mmCIF file of all heavy atoms in Angstrom:
data_model
loop_
_atom_site.group_PDB
_atom_site.id
_atom_site.type_symbol
_atom_site.label_atom_id
_atom_site.label_comp_id
_atom_site.label_asym_id
_atom_site.label_seq_id
_atom_site.Cartn_x
_atom_site.Cartn_y
_atom_site.Cartn_z
ATOM 1 N N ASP A 1 71.947 -30.758 -65.218
ATOM 2 C CA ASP A 1 73.081 -31.587 -64.930
ATOM 3 C C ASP A 1 73.201 -32.805 -65.834
ATOM 4 O O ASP A 1 74.242 -33.025 -66.473
ATOM 5 C CB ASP A 1 73.071 -32.003 -63.490
ATOM 6 C CG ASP A 1 73.220 -30.796 -62.515
ATOM 7 O OD1 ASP A 1 73.543 -29.632 -62.925
ATOM 8 O OD2 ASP A 1 73.047 -31.020 -61.295
ATOM 9 N N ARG A 2 72.128 -33.512 -66.031
ATOM 10 C CA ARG A 2 72.119 -34.615 -66.944
ATOM 11 C C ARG A 2 72.441 -34.187 -68.381
ATOM 12 O O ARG A 2 73.130 -34.909 -69.059
ATOM 13 C CB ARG A 2 70.751 -35.237 -66.864
ATOM 14 C CG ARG A 2 70.679 -36.515 -67.627
ATOM 15 C CD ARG A 2 69.394 -37.332 -67.371
ATOM 16 N NE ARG A 2 68.258 -36.608 -67.811
ATOM 17 C CZ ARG A 2 67.818 -36.508 -69.073
ATOM 18 N NH1 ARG A 2 68.369 -37.111 -70.119
ATOM 19 N NH2 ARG A 2 66.809 -35.751 -69.292
ATOM 20 N N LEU A 3 72.040 -32.975 -68.833
ATOM 21 C CA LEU A 3 72.368 -32.495 -70.194
ATOM 22 C C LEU A 3 73.700 -31.728 -70.261
ATOM 23 O O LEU A 3 74.048 -31.287 -71.321
ATOM 24 C CB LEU A 3 71.275 -31.636 -70.767
ATOM 25 C CG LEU A 3 69.881 -32.333 -70.906
ATOM 26 C CD1 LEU A 3 68.820 -31.387 -71.416
ATOM 27 C CD2 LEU A 3 69.880 -33.619 -71.697
ATOM 28 N N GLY A 4 74.428 -31.567 -69.160
ATOM 29 C CA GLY A 4 75.740 -30.854 -69.196
ATOM 30 C C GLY A 4 75.603 -29.309 -69.331
ATOM 31 O O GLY A 4 76.555 -28.612 -69.552
ATOM 32 N N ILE A 5 74.401 -28.779 -69.119
ATOM 33 C CA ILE A 5 74.181 -27.363 -69.239
ATOM 34 C C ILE A 5 74.750 -26.670 -67.986
ATOM 35 O O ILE A 5 74.283 -26.898 -66.882
ATOM 36 C CB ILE A 5 72.694 -27.074 -69.389
ATOM 37 C CG1 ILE A 5 72.285 -27.592 -70.818
ATOM 38 C CG2 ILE A 5 72.476 -25.563 -69.309
ATOM 39 C CD1 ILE A 5 70.784 -27.634 -71.079
ATOM 40 N N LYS A 6 75.729 -25.818 -68.188
ATOM 41 C CA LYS A 6 76.417 -25.165 -67.098
ATOM 42 C C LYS A 6 76.135 -23.671 -67.072
ATOM 43 O O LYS A 6 76.697 -23.002 -66.240
ATOM 44 C CB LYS A 6 77.896 -25.436 -67.193
ATOM 45 C CG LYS A 6 78.195 -26.862 -66.794
ATOM 46 C CD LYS A 6 79.664 -27.064 -66.959
ATOM 47 C CE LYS A 6 80.239 -28.247 -66.230
ATOM 48 N NZ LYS A 6 79.684 -29.459 -66.855
ATOM 49 N N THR A 7 75.457 -23.098 -68.045
ATOM 50 C CA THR A 7 75.218 -21.642 -68.000
ATOM 51 C C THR A 7 73.767 -21.452 -67.650
ATOM 52 O O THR A 7 72.959 -22.328 -67.912
ATOM 53 C CB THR A 7 75.563 -20.869 -69.297
ATOM 54 O OG1 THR A 7 74.838 -21.331 -70.395
ATOM 55 C CG2 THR A 7 76.942 -21.088 -69.664
ATOM 56 N N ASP A 8 73.447 -20.341 -66.996
ATOM 57 C CA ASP A 8 72.043 -19.945 -66.772
ATOM 58 C C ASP A 8 71.381 -19.453 -68.077
ATOM 59 O O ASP A 8 71.501 -18.229 -68.514
ATOM 60 C CB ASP A 8 71.991 -18.828 -65.762
ATOM 61 C CG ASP A 8 70.527 -18.442 -65.363
ATOM 62 O OD1 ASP A 8 69.526 -19.013 -65.831
ATOM 63 O OD2 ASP A 8 70.409 -17.606 -64.494
ATOM 64 N N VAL A 9 70.736 -20.383 -68.766
ATOM 65 C CA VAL A 9 70.181 -20.048 -70.080
ATOM 66 C C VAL A 9 69.020 -19.102 -70.009
ATOM 67 O O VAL A 9 68.688 -18.402 -70.985
ATOM 68 C CB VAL A 9 69.841 -21.302 -70.924
ATOM 69 C CG1 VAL A 9 71.148 -22.125 -71.232
ATOM 70 C CG2 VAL A 9 68.728 -22.114 -70.227
ATOM 71 N N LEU A 10 68.411 -19.005 -68.842
ATOM 72 C CA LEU A 10 67.349 -17.995 -68.681
ATOM 73 C C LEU A 10 67.811 -16.654 -68.258
ATOM 74 O O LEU A 10 67.528 -15.679 -68.935
ATOM 75 C CB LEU A 10 66.254 -18.500 -67.700
ATOM 76 C CG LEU A 10 65.589 -19.786 -68.065
ATOM 77 C CD1 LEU A 10 64.780 -20.256 -66.842
ATOM 78 C CD2 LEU A 10 64.728 -19.602 -69.298
ATOM 79 N N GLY A 11 68.412 -16.562 -67.087
ATOM 80 C CA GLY A 11 68.824 -15.293 -66.525
ATOM 81 C C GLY A 11 69.951 -14.578 -67.311
ATOM 82 O O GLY A 11 69.915 -13.399 -67.490
ATOM 83 N N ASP A 12 70.976 -15.314 -67.703
ATOM 84 C CA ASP A 12 72.156 -14.779 -68.373
ATOM 85 C C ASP A 12 72.035 -14.835 -69.889
ATOM 86 O O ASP A 12 72.352 -13.907 -70.502
ATOM 87 C CB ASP A 12 73.391 -15.516 -67.933
ATOM 88 C CG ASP A 12 73.700 -15.318 -66.460
ATOM 89 O OD1 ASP A 12 73.353 -14.248 -65.896
ATOM 90 O OD2 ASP A 12 74.365 -16.189 -65.842
ATOM 91 N N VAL A 13 71.593 -15.890 -70.514
ATOM 92 C CA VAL A 13 71.568 -15.910 -71.994
ATOM 93 C C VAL A 13 70.287 -15.163 -72.437
ATOM 94 O O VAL A 13 70.401 -14.123 -72.989
ATOM 95 C CB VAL A 13 71.685 -17.336 -72.574
ATOM 96 C CG1 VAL A 13 71.532 -17.323 -74.096
ATOM 97 C CG2 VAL A 13 72.996 -17.924 -72.130
ATOM 98 N N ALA A 14 69.083 -15.670 -72.123
ATOM 99 C CA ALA A 14 67.858 -15.032 -72.560
ATOM 100 C C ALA A 14 67.670 -13.680 -71.908
ATOM 101 O O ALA A 14 67.128 -12.758 -72.520
ATOM 102 C CB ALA A 14 66.648 -15.969 -72.428
ATOM 103 N N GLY A 15 68.147 -13.498 -70.692
ATOM 104 C CA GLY A 15 68.038 -12.184 -70.059
ATOM 105 C C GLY A 15 66.689 -11.996 -69.313
ATOM 106 O O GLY A 15 66.235 -10.904 -69.026
ATOM 107 N N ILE A 16 66.050 -13.106 -68.934
ATOM 108 C CA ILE A 16 64.811 -13.027 -68.093
ATOM 109 C C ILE A 16 65.048 -13.485 -66.668
ATOM 110 O O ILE A 16 65.447 -14.625 -66.495
ATOM 111 C CB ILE A 16 63.651 -13.860 -68.736
ATOM 112 C CG1 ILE A 16 62.385 -13.628 -67.969
ATOM 113 C CG2 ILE A 16 64.044 -15.301 -69.020
ATOM 114 C CD1 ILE A 16 61.166 -14.252 -68.636
ATOM 115 N N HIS A 17 64.783 -12.591 -65.704
ATOM 116 C CA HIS A 17 64.968 -12.781 -64.303
ATOM 117 C C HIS A 17 63.665 -13.210 -63.609
ATOM 118 O O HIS A 17 63.726 -13.949 -62.667
ATOM 119 C CB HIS A 17 65.538 -11.507 -63.679
ATOM 120 C CG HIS A 17 66.806 -11.067 -64.368
ATOM 121 N ND1 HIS A 17 67.934 -11.867 -64.437
ATOM 122 C CD2 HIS A 17 67.083 -9.978 -65.155
ATOM 123 C CE1 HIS A 17 68.867 -11.279 -65.176
ATOM 124 N NE2 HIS A 17 68.387 -10.119 -65.605
ATOM 125 N N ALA A 18 62.490 -12.768 -64.104
ATOM 126 C CA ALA A 18 61.190 -13.095 -63.517
ATOM 127 C C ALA A 18 60.146 -12.960 -64.617
ATOM 128 O O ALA A 18 60.393 -12.285 -65.672
ATOM 129 C CB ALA A 18 60.891 -12.176 -62.336
ATOM 130 N N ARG A 19 59.002 -13.585 -64.414
ATOM 131 C CA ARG A 19 57.811 -13.302 -65.203
ATOM 132 C C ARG A 19 56.618 -13.300 -64.222
ATOM 133 O O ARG A 19 56.770 -13.787 -63.129
ATOM 134 C CB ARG A 19 57.659 -14.309 -66.339
ATOM 135 C CG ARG A 19 57.174 -15.784 -66.071
ATOM 136 C CD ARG A 19 58.264 -16.591 -65.444
ATOM 137 N NE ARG A 19 59.388 -16.863 -66.329
ATOM 138 C CZ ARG A 19 60.671 -16.876 -65.987
ATOM 139 N NH1 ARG A 19 61.072 -16.455 -64.777
ATOM 140 N NH2 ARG A 19 61.626 -17.250 -66.862
ATOM 141 N N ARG A 20 55.487 -12.832 -64.638
ATOM 142 C CA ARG A 20 54.268 -12.844 -63.862
ATOM 143 C C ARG A 20 53.253 -13.872 -64.343
ATOM 144 O O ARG A 20 53.176 -14.155 -65.585
ATOM 145 C CB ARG A 20 53.626 -11.469 -63.923
ATOM 146 C CG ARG A 20 54.430 -10.356 -63.351
ATOM 147 C CD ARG A 20 54.758 -10.540 -61.922
ATOM 148 N NE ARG A 20 55.442 -9.301 -61.499
ATOM 149 C CZ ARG A 20 54.813 -8.198 -61.105
ATOM 150 N NH1 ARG A 20 53.514 -8.119 -61.035
ATOM 151 N NH2 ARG A 20 55.521 -7.134 -60.779
ATOM 152 N N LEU A 21 52.484 -14.424 -63.413
ATOM 153 C CA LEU A 21 51.454 -15.405 -63.685
ATOM 154 C C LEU A 21 50.173 -14.997 -62.952
ATOM 155 O O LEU A 21 50.249 -14.381 -61.846
ATOM 156 C CB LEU A 21 51.976 -16.767 -63.258
ATOM 157 C CG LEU A 21 53.151 -17.395 -64.021
ATOM 158 C CD1 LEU A 21 53.413 -18.734 -63.444
ATOM 159 C CD2 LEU A 21 52.868 -17.556 -65.494
ATOM 160 N N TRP A 22 49.039 -15.350 -63.556
ATOM 161 C CA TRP A 22 47.731 -15.292 -62.935
ATOM 162 C C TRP A 22 47.499 -16.487 -62.013
ATOM 163 O O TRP A 22 48.275 -17.429 -62.014
ATOM 164 C CB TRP A 22 46.588 -15.297 -63.951
ATOM 165 C CG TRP A 22 46.744 -14.337 -65.108
ATOM 166 C CD1 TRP A 22 47.027 -14.653 -66.387
ATOM 167 C CD2 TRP A 22 46.519 -12.896 -65.086
ATOM 168 N NE1 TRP A 22 46.995 -13.489 -67.150
ATOM 169 C CE2 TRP A 22 46.634 -12.438 -66.406
ATOM 170 C CE3 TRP A 22 46.189 -11.982 -64.071
ATOM 171 C CZ2 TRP A 22 46.574 -11.120 -66.741
ATOM 172 C CZ3 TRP A 22 46.020 -10.662 -64.402
ATOM 173 C CH2 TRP A 22 46.300 -10.247 -65.774
ATOM 174 N N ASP A 23 46.358 -16.459 -61.327
ATOM 175 C CA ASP A 23 45.769 -17.667 -60.734
ATOM 176 C C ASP A 23 45.330 -18.591 -61.898
ATOM 177 O O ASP A 23 45.043 -18.147 -63.047
ATOM 178 C CB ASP A 23 44.596 -17.344 -59.826
ATOM 179 C CG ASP A 23 45.024 -16.917 -58.384
ATOM 180 O OD1 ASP A 23 46.196 -17.172 -57.892
ATOM 181 O OD2 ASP A 23 44.123 -16.408 -57.671
ATOM 182 N N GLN A 24 45.338 -19.889 -61.591
ATOM 183 C CA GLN A 24 44.977 -20.906 -62.523
ATOM 184 C C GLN A 24 43.575 -20.666 -63.058
ATOM 185 O O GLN A 24 43.326 -21.074 -64.149
ATOM 186 C CB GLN A 24 45.008 -22.299 -61.824
ATOM 187 C CG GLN A 24 44.175 -23.466 -62.443
ATOM 188 C CD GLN A 24 44.290 -24.798 -61.573
ATOM 189 O OE1 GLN A 24 45.379 -25.398 -61.517
ATOM 190 N NE2 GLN A 24 43.194 -25.197 -60.890
ATOM 191 N N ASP A 25 42.655 -20.080 -62.308
ATOM 192 C CA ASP A 25 41.336 -19.880 -62.798
ATOM 193 C C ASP A 25 41.107 -18.632 -63.721
ATOM 194 O O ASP A 25 39.993 -18.396 -64.167
ATOM 195 C CB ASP A 25 40.267 -19.927 -61.656
ATOM 196 C CG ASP A 25 40.423 -18.810 -60.594
ATOM 197 O OD1 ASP A 25 41.448 -18.097 -60.642
ATOM 198 O OD2 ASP A 25 39.536 -18.663 -59.647
ATOM 199 N N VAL A 26 42.147 -17.898 -64.072
ATOM 200 C CA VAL A 26 41.974 -16.719 -64.846
ATOM 201 C C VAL A 26 41.989 -17.088 -66.304
ATOM 202 O O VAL A 26 42.904 -17.679 -66.821
ATOM 203 C CB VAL A 26 43.039 -15.650 -64.519
ATOM 204 C CG1 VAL A 26 43.010 -14.440 -65.481
ATOM 205 C CG2 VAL A 26 42.827 -15.188 -63.095
ATOM 206 N N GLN A 27 40.981 -16.691 -67.003
ATOM 207 C CA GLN A 27 40.956 -17.057 -68.419
ATOM 208 C C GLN A 27 41.426 -15.790 -69.149
ATOM 209 O O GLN A 27 41.319 -14.729 -68.606
ATOM 210 C CB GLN A 27 39.550 -17.243 -68.880
ATOM 211 C CG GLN A 27 38.740 -18.144 -68.050
ATOM 212 C CD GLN A 27 38.652 -19.393 -68.692
ATOM 213 O OE1 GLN A 27 39.685 -19.977 -68.886
ATOM 214 N NE2 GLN A 27 37.444 -19.796 -69.167
ATOM 215 N N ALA A 28 41.686 -15.904 -70.439
ATOM 216 C CA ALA A 28 41.992 -14.794 -71.310
ATOM 217 C C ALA A 28 40.991 -13.703 -71.336
ATOM 218 O O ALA A 28 41.349 -12.518 -71.258
ATOM 219 C CB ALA A 28 42.213 -15.336 -72.681
ATOM 220 N N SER A 29 39.713 -14.066 -71.451
ATOM 221 C CA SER A 29 38.660 -13.084 -71.457
ATOM 222 C C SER A 29 38.612 -12.233 -70.149
ATOM 223 O O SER A 29 38.209 -11.115 -70.134
ATOM 224 C CB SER A 29 37.296 -13.807 -71.610
ATOM 225 O OG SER A 29 36.987 -14.698 -70.552
ATOM 226 N N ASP A 30 38.887 -12.870 -69.034
ATOM 227 C CA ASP A 30 38.882 -12.219 -67.681
ATOM 228 C C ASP A 30 40.049 -11.194 -67.613
ATOM 229 O O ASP A 30 39.841 -10.064 -67.191
ATOM 230 C CB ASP A 30 39.189 -13.217 -66.581
ATOM 231 C CG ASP A 30 38.126 -14.335 -66.460
ATOM 232 O OD1 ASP A 30 36.903 -13.990 -66.479
ATOM 233 O OD2 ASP A 30 38.540 -15.534 -66.273
ATOM 234 N N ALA A 31 41.254 -11.615 -68.004
ATOM 235 C CA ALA A 31 42.401 -10.651 -68.071
ATOM 236 C C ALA A 31 42.059 -9.464 -69.054
ATOM 237 O O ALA A 31 42.239 -8.284 -68.738
ATOM 238 C CB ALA A 31 43.669 -11.357 -68.525
ATOM 239 N N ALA A 32 41.536 -9.800 -70.227
ATOM 240 C CA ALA A 32 41.209 -8.761 -71.193
ATOM 241 C C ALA A 32 40.137 -7.800 -70.655
ATOM 242 O O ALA A 32 40.248 -6.617 -70.870
ATOM 243 C CB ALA A 32 40.702 -9.392 -72.493
ATOM 244 N N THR A 33 39.114 -8.317 -69.934
ATOM 245 C CA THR A 33 38.078 -7.484 -69.343
ATOM 246 C C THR A 33 38.636 -6.490 -68.334
ATOM 247 O O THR A 33 38.200 -5.333 -68.361
ATOM 248 C CB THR A 33 37.002 -8.372 -68.650
ATOM 249 O OG1 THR A 33 36.462 -9.248 -69.604
ATOM 250 C CG2 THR A 33 35.868 -7.633 -68.023
ATOM 251 N N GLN A 34 39.558 -6.969 -67.483
ATOM 252 C CA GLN A 34 40.145 -6.109 -66.481
ATOM 253 C C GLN A 34 40.886 -4.943 -67.175
ATOM 254 O O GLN A 34 40.831 -3.803 -66.759
ATOM 255 C CB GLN A 34 41.125 -6.841 -65.577
ATOM 256 C CG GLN A 34 40.684 -7.975 -64.634
ATOM 257 C CD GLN A 34 41.908 -8.645 -63.928
ATOM 258 O OE1 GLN A 34 42.809 -7.923 -63.525
ATOM 259 N NE2 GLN A 34 42.027 -10.063 -63.948
ATOM 260 N N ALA A 35 41.630 -5.210 -68.219
ATOM 261 C CA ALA A 35 42.358 -4.160 -68.908
ATOM 262 C C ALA A 35 41.399 -3.212 -69.598
ATOM 263 O O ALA A 35 41.641 -1.973 -69.576
ATOM 264 C CB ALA A 35 43.296 -4.780 -69.940
ATOM 265 N N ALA A 36 40.323 -3.733 -70.170
ATOM 266 C CA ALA A 36 39.365 -2.911 -70.906
ATOM 267 C C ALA A 36 38.632 -1.922 -69.969
ATOM 268 O O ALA A 36 38.461 -0.764 -70.286
ATOM 269 C CB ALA A 36 38.317 -3.795 -71.559
ATOM 270 N N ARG A 37 38.260 -2.377 -68.766
ATOM 271 C CA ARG A 37 37.640 -1.438 -67.806
ATOM 272 C C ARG A 37 38.607 -0.297 -67.447
ATOM 273 O O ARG A 37 38.246 0.882 -67.470
ATOM 274 C CB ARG A 37 37.303 -2.183 -66.554
ATOM 275 C CG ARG A 37 36.112 -3.142 -66.780
ATOM 276 C CD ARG A 37 35.617 -3.686 -65.452
ATOM 277 N NE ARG A 37 34.887 -4.949 -65.585
ATOM 278 C CZ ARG A 37 33.625 -5.022 -65.958
ATOM 279 N NH1 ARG A 37 32.922 -3.910 -66.252
ATOM 280 N NH2 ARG A 37 33.024 -6.225 -65.972
ATOM 281 N N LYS A 38 39.863 -0.605 -67.364
ATOM 282 C CA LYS A 38 40.810 0.462 -67.083
ATOM 283 C C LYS A 38 41.057 1.370 -68.187
ATOM 284 O O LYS A 38 41.217 2.532 -67.973
ATOM 285 C CB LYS A 38 42.131 -0.047 -66.692
ATOM 286 C CG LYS A 38 42.183 -0.585 -65.370
ATOM 287 C CD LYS A 38 43.645 -0.726 -64.962
ATOM 288 C CE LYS A 38 44.435 0.527 -65.312
ATOM 289 N NZ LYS A 38 45.689 0.406 -64.509
ATOM 290 N N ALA A 39 41.023 0.880 -69.399
ATOM 291 C CA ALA A 39 41.197 1.778 -70.555
ATOM 292 C C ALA A 39 39.982 2.693 -70.831
ATOM 293 O O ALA A 39 40.134 3.811 -71.270
ATOM 294 C CB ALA A 39 41.447 0.921 -71.816
#
C-alpha cells in the first residue's frame, strides 16, 4: 500500500502460489542426507 503496488506480484505475475519450508533446525546436509538415503 505504501508503494502503490496493486497487483499480486507473487501469485499473478511470478506465478507462485505456495512454497515449502523445513523446520528452522534443518541444515543443508540433513536435507541432502534424507534424499541420499532414498536414492
